[PDB]
Amino acid sequence: PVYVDFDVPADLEDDALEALEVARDTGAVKKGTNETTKSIERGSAELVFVAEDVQPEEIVMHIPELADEKGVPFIFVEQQDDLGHAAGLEVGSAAAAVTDAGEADADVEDIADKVEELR
């Protein structure tokens, strides 16, 4: 919420989470804030996911600004438990990155395009 500057409509979040599941199976994903952070810094991140229910906010709050200076686009998801499940985990995940979008690569670019429009 201090790190959240724009609102994502449920439909967008649905499409992004869907894209994430397919990118999981047909492509590469990083789960967890440390691995996500690494991929932004290493440049291998295509799309970055960040949950809004993260307590404390410290875990994830560096991500937007970091992603911005690495040119990596990012999207907000409401509950970390969905983000973790979408990424293939029994537990939640505060952040995730798509490294290889796989078959969802067309959809990823479009979701990126939709979010830049949310500014």
Partner 1 sequence: ARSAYSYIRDAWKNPGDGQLAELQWQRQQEWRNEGAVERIERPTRLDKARSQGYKAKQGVIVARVSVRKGSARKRRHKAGRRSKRQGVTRITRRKDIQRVAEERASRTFPNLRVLNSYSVGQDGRQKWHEVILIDPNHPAIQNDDDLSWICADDQADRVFRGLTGAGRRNRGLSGKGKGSEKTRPSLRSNGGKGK
Binding site for partner 1 (CB under 8 A): 2-3, 33-34, 36-38, 41-42, 55-59, 61-62, 66
CB nearer to Cl ion: pick between 15 and 53: 53
User: Is residue 32 within the footprint of RNA (CB under 7 A)?
Assistant: yes
CA dihedral over 89, 94, 100, 105, signed as positive or negative: positive
Any bridge partners for residue 74, and if so which? 48
CA-CA distance, 18 to 55, in Å (whole number)? 25
Say how many residues touch RNA, by CB under 7 A: 5
Q: Which does 58 bind (CB under 5 to 8 A by kind): RNA, partner 1, Cl ion, none?
A: partner 1
The span of 30-38, 51-59, 69-77, 99-107 binding Cl ion (CB under 5 A) equals: 51-59
Structure token pair of residue 86 = 């979408």
User: Is residue 31 within the footprint of RNA (CB under 7 A)?
Assistant: yes
- Degrees (nearest 5) of the Cα angle 15, 52, 86? 40
Q: Which does 33 bind (CB under 5 to 8 A by kind): partner 1, RNA, Cl ion, none?
A: partner 1
User: What is the nearest approach in angstroms of partner 1 to the Cβ of residue 32?
Assistant: 8
- β-strand pairing of 74-77 with 47-51: parallel
Sheet with 28-31: strands ordered across: 28-31, 95-100, 47-51, 74-77
Residue ranges binding RNA (CB under 7 A):
31-32, 34-35, 38
